[PDB]
Design a protein around this ligand. Structure first.
Ligand SMILES: CCCCCN(C[C@@H](O)[C@H](Cc1ccccc1)NC(=O)[C@@H](NC(C)=O)C(C)C)S(=O)(=O)c1ccc2ncsc2c1
Lengths: 99, 99
């Protein structure tokens, strides 16, 4: 698809068999989802943005289907204000900015 | 142009005829610039990010050029670690996400 930006670029994702809404975020290095259960071992990590740093759980090699496009990559889980799809997965789905 | 997302989508912007590097950020509602001493009236505002809120100064109707594309709108100024071009300006330059 081509997505304009008059509204937040929210899309439906499927992860660990569950549907969620997530923001396509070119300003995010990493993909960060709200607290949830994922299978496998996680590593404690910290990430930062505006407002400072939070503690997250890093899950590696996690399949996510984003708007019908498959990705398998690193997914951080923690107290993010919104589900964020970052550049690590946006590149996997062939997403670019155009103007 | 087309901008891939292998690295942060940083571009040159002009504000006050002065050049700066800024992130093209689809996850940002508003435009947030690092501390700078812009002339004119402003309003205090709080904006929320991954780790909490920061205090910003809201300036209205500020001309900005983004990659040689003219825009004019609201710019928030405050202690952000990176200059952020948000959707309020991205729409004005015809920027889309595409995959
Ligand atoms: C929480 C709501 C959704 C994300 C919003 N952020 C934009 C986001 O792209 C920032 C943009 C950003 C802010 C600060 C440093 C680096 C990028 N990225 C990050 O926080 C990421 N951090 C990094 C390092 O990529 C995380 C998600 C991994 S934001 O920067 O917090 C933001 C920007 C503009 C704006 N206007 C009104 S509220 C508001 C909030």
């Amino acid at each position: 698809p081509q997505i304009t930006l008059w509204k937040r670029p929210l899309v439906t994702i499927r992860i660990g068999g569950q549907l969620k809404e997530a923001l396509l975020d070119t300003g995010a290095d990493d993909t960060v989802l709200e607290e949830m259960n994922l299978p496998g071992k996680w590593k404690p990590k910290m990430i930062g943005g505006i407002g400072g740093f939070i503690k997250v759980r890093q899950y590696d090699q996690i399949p996510i289907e984003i708007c019908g496009h498959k990705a398998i990559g690193t997914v951080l889980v923690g107290p993010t204000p919104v589900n964020i799809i970052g550049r690590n997965l946006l590149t996997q789905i062939g997403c670019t900015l155009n103007f």
